[PDB]
Design a protein around this ligand. Sequence first.
Ligand SMILES: CCCCCCCCCCCC(=O)O
Ligand SMILES: CCCCCCCCCCCC(=O)O
Length: 90
Amino acid sequence: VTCGQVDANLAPCVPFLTQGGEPGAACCSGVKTLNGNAQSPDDRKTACNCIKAAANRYPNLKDDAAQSLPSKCGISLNVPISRTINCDTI
Ligand SMILES: CCCCCCCCCCCC(=O)O
Ligand SMILES: CCCCCCCCCCCC(=O)O
C-alpha cells in the first residue's frame, strides 16, 4: 500500500468532504477500493497513516463528514475517523 494510491482513490471524496451532502459513486468506489486493497494489519496501518498525511494536507476540514463516509459508502472500520488516532497502535 502506497500513499499515492490512497490519494488517487480518495480524490473524488474532496467535494463531499468540503461541501457535505451525499458522497457520489466515484467517492464510494474509491473508499471501497482502498478498504479492499488494505488487507493485512501492516497494509491497514500504512493506509491509515497515508490518510492522516492527506488530512494534514487538508487541515481545515472538520471530522463529521469523514466520520459518516464509511457508513454512507457501505463499509465498516475498526477505528474512528479522527485526525488524532494513532495508526500504529491498534
Ligand atoms: C483502516 C485501513 C484503511 C481502510 C480504508 C478505509 C477507507 C477510507 C475511509 C476513510 C476516508 C477518510 O475519512 O478520509
Ligand atoms: C482508517 C480511517 C481513519 C483514517 C485516519 C485519519 C482519518 C481522519 C482524518 C481527518 C479526516 C478529514 O477530515 O479529512
